[PDB]
Design a protein around this ligand. Structure first.
Ligand SMILES: CCCCCC(=O)CC(=O)N[C@H]1CCOC1=O
Ligand SMILES: CCCCCC(=O)CC(=O)N[C@H]1CCOC1=O
Lengths: 230, 230
DNA sequence: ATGTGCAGATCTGCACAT
DNA sequence: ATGTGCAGATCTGCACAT
């Protein structure tokens, strides 16, 4: 199946609200075996966040303003280039409340990850993090820094529009699957790209189809497009 | 006291009206001294543009089908990293009607330029480009990508309408059958209602499909409805 | 420019166990 | 509440005329 960056690009083009968006993010993050994702939009110290990370970990992350201690975030600030962190392989270098920070984090599968920092509007920033419960991250091929930037930029933008610009939003799968159908792919081809069972694609769409009571994909497509659903 | 990518990053957040956006786009090109800016979203054979470029260049570029000629577009297709194009320095190298192209383009201040290509949803792409009248011109590719991703999101997601696009059409017959198709009718059903031979509907639509080069009614209707051909 | 004719490919519609 | 199987229903892709 296509890489998570591509899945993220594909996602950043669907409607509509934060709930949907969050759902799809989680789905992608799971798919590639990640404890969760974490999108942070930070302006000085105020901090907007869309994340998967355990509700507990978030509570304490903010309650203790870990945003200042977090080495990942610190690094995200000093450079807008994709990077990977481990906490373990990093433990030897400086760390004391840091060393302890990672530990508390570990209790929630957040041991290592990939973080893509973006220079956002008005001099601010955004960073997207795919978090792994493994000690470190070894990749067969390094992820393209330029590609990462381009997709996170699209996600950042997409997320911001939630709070800037029917409400029967199709759920992320119906949406992502339907958008392929709209570009010609056949279900089995969709399944091949998404890394899911043909029956998955098969079911998701017939259900959407039933919802609207239409007898053909073309109809679902026409219908979905006309109602600004995809 | 800024670079244009910076201003473009900001512009990406702007609200909200279509015109408001396009103006913002032009204002940034002007502020920096650019004959213009150009945003292209290459889908299939289908192209959509949002430009500052001269009203004439626009109209001709598509009529003359320079999509397939422009050495800048071609390069962007096989490259998704920021790059500059001279037009003068490029004359030595290959150039059949290419040499003609750059000259004719020079008739509108488009001599050199900076183009940034990005990968968008469903494996398509978009590219952003700033045109200068200078013979040639003299940036962080990662930063460049991060920005354009935001602009693409902002242009793309809010359904802004193009300032131009490769022309394509549907004739009355096609448009009538496709409109039924877009309502879940089967081809046999269509033939019965419009009172014609199954094979007429078949061949007609079949023909349109070949013209746009798509493998499925859905794709065809998805396309038609999106390029307002119906 | 328009059809005919067919042979896979691919959906769709149903029934049923997971 | 989903995932499986299936077969009749449609469509898509050539080949060969009109
Ligand atoms: C409340 C959501 C937490 C945001 C944290 C984040 O941005 C992602 C990140 O790299 N931080 C990781 C580093 C170790 O544990 C974390 O939390
Ligand atoms: C409809 C207007 C077409 C815009 C396409 C574009 O991207 C332009 C561009 O960068 N290339 C330049 C190179 C020489 O003249 C151009 O068009």
């Amino acid at each position: 199946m296509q890489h998570w960056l591509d899945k993220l690009t594909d996602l950043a083009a669907i409607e509509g609200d934060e709930c949907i968006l969050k759902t799809g993010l989680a789905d992608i993050a799971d798919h590639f075996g990640f404890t969760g994702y974490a999108y942070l939009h930070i302006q000085h110290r105020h901090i907007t966040a869309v994340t998967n990370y355990h509700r507990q970990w978030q509570s304490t992350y903010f309650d203790k303003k870990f945003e200042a201690l977090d080495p990942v975030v610190k690094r995200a600030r000093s450079r807008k280039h994709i990077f990977t962190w481990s906490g373990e392989h990093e433990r030897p270098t400086l760390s004391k409340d840091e060393r302890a920070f990672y530990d508390h984090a570990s209790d929630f599968g957040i041991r290592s990850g990939i973080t893509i920092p973006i220079k956002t509007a008005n001099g601010f920033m955004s960073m997207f993090t795919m978090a792994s419960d493994k000690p470190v991250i070894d990749l067969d091929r390094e992820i393209d820094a330029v590609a990462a930037a381009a997709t996170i930029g699209q996600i950042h933008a997409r997320i911001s529009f939630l709070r800037t610009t029917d409400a029967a939003w199709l759920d992320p799968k119906e949406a992502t699957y339907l958008r392929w159908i709209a570009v010609g792919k056949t279900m089995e081809e969709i399944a091949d790209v998404e890394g899911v069972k043909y029956n998955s694609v098969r079911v998701k769409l017939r259900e959407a189809m039933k919802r609207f009571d239409v007898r053909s994909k073309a109809h679902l497509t026409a219908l979905a497009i006309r109602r600004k659903l995809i």
